[PDB]
RNA sequence: ACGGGUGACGGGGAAUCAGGGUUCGAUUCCGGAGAGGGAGCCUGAGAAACGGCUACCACAUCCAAGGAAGGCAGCAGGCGCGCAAAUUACCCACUCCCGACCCGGGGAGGUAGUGACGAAAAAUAACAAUACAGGACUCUUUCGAGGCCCUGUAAUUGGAAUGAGUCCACUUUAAAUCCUUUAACGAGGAUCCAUUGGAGGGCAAGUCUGGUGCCAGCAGCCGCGGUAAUUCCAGCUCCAAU
């Protein structure tokens, strides 16, 4: 007894995708996890779960109904290409480096003192 | 520079006079028939009335056929006739003035659970609303203040998800139902 | 009678005896409803002169 | 109005200005002498170094010695007679303790019996002497 | 006119309002000005620039004593002037800028923290039965009967509800938190305990008890206190906002 209905559908030939407002009815249980939601669209649009991306869900007072803005693509090749990083990181296929912007600003202003191929020795 | 609004107003004005004998008696029985919780509550049903009434005298200064008055006529009126304060047979807007505080105070949801065959006393009703029991087309209102539309009124009831309607046994019924199992064993 | 020697005299020499107990107070509408009854829905139009609500002859 | 002409407009307007300087609650306002005198200089509170406790007599019909203080302020370095309010609270100023002085009711105009005195106490060093009366806070050692 | 003063940056606007008016406007939009105090210029389409440059004045950072550089009215912070105002926290995800760029960078901006400056929704109980007190009404000159419609306050007795809370995970998101959703547990003094001010009169509410004895104090104005205080100090009661 979990039931999905799409809403406001469009296709970007020029971004290579399906986009639409996914709409949910869920009387009785807590709001639902997204590896459940993905795989239920996958026989609404008979692709794999892999390509599809659904983010953002505001819920409804009294319990009942939530509202998302999922979007479906063509191939994985393109799915890394034309889409944000955070919305790959979630699905386990991008990882940015291990220094937050404390380190990196200290290290710019010590290169700024040193001159020439002396600049490489400040970095290890 | 920032990405915000600052926008807001008050909703109630306080009377020039303090310590009277003719007014201290009449605002305190508005708290009895309907079950309001403080003065403030009362003072703002008025301020919304007062507001309507000054615009009406603004329009009556104008001539008939003046195109602002016709348009802003209709609006000001229908705006009181989708929610049954004025009635169909008073389009004319002298009738808007002779129009008083008690008709606003009985559209409020609080009063609309006392009158309809679903609450025993009125002071029960302002505790049915706030304990999230009752709903208005599949949507739970939690708020007495809610002024009610005349389209809606036939759709008020007990929410599906409730012990006072359809559902699973509650906190205190099910505990002393669960206590009877713990006692015999 | 009283330079700056003579001060606190009476807050001093009064008979500091304790305050009493009583049953617990109510607030909100639940209160207000309380007073609504007192002054209106019940009472008798009593003969002649009305005694105030804190009255003692 | 008295000079009813249609193009008078300035004759009319040079006369009220002239006039309004006769107004008191205004001139007291529109010259620098009101703020030259004033201890607070233009302000709602201002703190100061106490220096001696002092009893002032009251004026007639009434009689009863009234308990005051003599403060030196900070900013100006000026000296004011002030006045404690509650019963038995003078036992709480020690000499050269600090106080937050305030006004007293009616702005540059005293209250009742006590002559000269236009100022009074709210605090005694970071906690209000109201509280001390009740006893809701007590004093450091 | 000229001179002086202004607790004077200007303007879109703000508070008060029968009509007419009187005050305010350093501040998220436009226009001006300035980067401790004056002066002057290199580079340029665009500077008399100052997180560019050279002096002098006021001040401040090291020296192996010859020398050498410094300017938060940018963000955080801290000493001072005070009646008087927060974290040396986290990102380019949004928003837009710059560049040789679809690819970097941005205390500009975004997001959490402290915040009773102000504005808006809104808990501190609700419902049954047993004592008890008042008005119809059918009848009684008056007792009593029915109380159908109730009307009310009582550490009498009874279970129904809930939001404060503790806590698995979904959701939120650049990563968190918050609100929204959800199992598990969570109320009879519902101790899971509402204050702040007043009671002679203006002006709502005690000619009540127990202290003081023009003293101590109250009282914005008129006044109180003279060894029977409707006013101080306090015991029970009570009114007005909440």
Curated annotation (Swiss-Prot), chain B:
Its main location: cytoplasm. SUPFAM superfamilies: Alpha-L RNA-binding motif. Residues 161-185 are annotated as: Disordered. GO terms for cellular component: cytosolic ribosome; cytosolic small ribosomal subunit; nucleolus. The keyword rRNA-binding applies. Component of the small ribosomal subunit. Identified in a IGF2BP1-dependent mRNP granule complex containing untranslated mRNAs. Part of the small subunit (SSU) processome, composed of more than 70 proteins and the RNA chaperone small nucleolar RNA (snoRNA) U3. Residues 107-181 form the S4 RNA-binding domain. It is found in: Cytoplasm; Nucleus, Nucleolus. It comes from Oryctolagus cuniculus (Rabbit). There is a cross-link at residues 92, 138 (Glycyl lysine isopeptide (Lys-Gly) (interchain with G-Cter in SUMO2)). The modification Phosphoserine is found at residues 152, 162. GO terms for biological process: ribosomal small subunit biogenesis; translation. Component of the small ribosomal subunit. The ribosome is a large ribonucleoprotein complex responsible for the synthesis of proteins in the cell. Part of the small subunit (SSU) processome, first precursor of the small eukaryotic ribosomal subunit. During the assembly of the SSU processome in the nucleolus, many ribosome biogenesis factors, an RNA chaperone and ribosomal proteins associate with the nascent pre-rRNA and work in concert to generate RNA folding, modifications, rearrangements and cleavage as well as targeted degradation of pre-ribosomal RNA by the RNA exosome. Belongs to the universal ribosomal protein uS4 family. Keywords: Acetylation, Cytoplasm, Isopeptide bond, Nucleus, Phosphoprotein, Ribonucleoprotein, Ribosomal protein, RNA-binding, rRNA-binding, Ubl conjugation. This is Small ribosomal subunit protein uS4. The modification N6-acetyllysine is found at residues 65, 115, 154.
UniProtKB/Swiss-Prot annotation, chain C:
Signal peptide: none annotated. It is found in: Cytoplasm; Nucleus. It comes from the Eukaryota. The modification N6-succinyllysine is found at residue 49. Component of the 40S subunit of the ribosome. Component of the 40S subunit of the ribosome. Contributes to the assembly and function of 40S ribosomal subunits. This is Small ribosomal subunit protein eS30. It comes from Oryctolagus cuniculus (Rabbit). The chain holds residues 77 to 133 of 133 of the full protein.
Swiss-Prot record, chain D:
Hydroxylation at Pro-61 affects translation termination efficiency. Pfam families: Ribosom_S12_S23. The keyword Cell membrane does not apply. It comes from the Eukaryota. One of its GO terms (molecular function) is structural constituent of ribosome. Residues 1-25 are annotated as: Disordered. This is Small ribosomal subunit protein uS12. It comes from Oryctolagus cuniculus (Rabbit). The lineage of its organism: Eukaryota, Metazoa, Chordata, Craniata, Vertebrata. The gene is RPS23.
